[PDB]
Amino acid sequence: VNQHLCGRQLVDALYLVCGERGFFYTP
């Protein structure tokens, strides 16, 4: 429900905020 859309927004934001550095996603 809310967590899936929130995590999608989260991943899309981390991509930008990190750039070529990369990020880790742990729900």
Next chain:
Amino acid sequence: IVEQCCTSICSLYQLENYCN
């Protein structure tokens, strides 16, 4: 992340603290 940025609204620095 899903506990501190999903309930509240994280800023750009809080999201940058999750940068690998």
